[PDB]
Design a binder for this molecule. Structure first.
Ligand SMILES: COc1cccc(-n2cnnn2)c1
Length: 153
């Protein structure tokens, strides 16, 4: 689609020139729909000083379907599984999800960054991590720092 191509050119321009703080997103090679991203661990979170790489695949029906995004860097988190799958509303279409075409790549990467600082334990992909987050926060923070040290630094 040329509608899709023109939109991706604009988004890549905006990601290059006005990236959200802590976030970078780029073309892996020469295809505007095969992207990579990076989110820095937030300050005052157990992921601080980690650098987290993500894969960002733009489906054929974008912007009417959401970007398909998974962590490539392992992360210890209630809403992200061991393969990097992310449970987040803006990465899914209605009725269950929140994606709409007025969101964009920068918007959902910012939502993922926020998810990292503020887990949603009521909708987990990792039930044991979620219970630990809810009921033994000091142990969750220590495990999340150690996982960051081992895999993201
Ligand atoms: C609030 O609960 C929700 C809402 C929307 C999507 C999800 N998903 C989690 N993993 N895939 N979708 C969970």
């Amino acid at each position: 689609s040329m509608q899709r191509a023109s939109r991706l050119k604009r988004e890549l321009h905006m990601l290059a020139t006005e990236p959200p703080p802590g976030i970078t997103c780029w073309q892996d090679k020469d295809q505007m729909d095969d992207l990579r991203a990076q989110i820095l661990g937030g300050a005052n979170t157990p992921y601080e000083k980690g650098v987290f790489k993500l894969e960002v695949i733009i489906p054929e029906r974008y912007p009417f379907e959401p970007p398909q995004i998974r962590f490539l860097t392992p992360i210890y988190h209630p809403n992200i599984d061991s393969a990097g799958r992310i449970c987040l509303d803006v990465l899914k279409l209605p009725p269950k999800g929140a994606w709409r075409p007025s969101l964009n790549i920068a918007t959902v990467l910012t939502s993922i960054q926020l998810l990292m600082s503020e887990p949603n334990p009521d909708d987990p992909l990792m039930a044991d991590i979620s219970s630990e987050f809810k009921y033994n926060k000091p142990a969750f923070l220590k495990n999340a720092r150690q996982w960051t040290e081992k895999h993201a630094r």
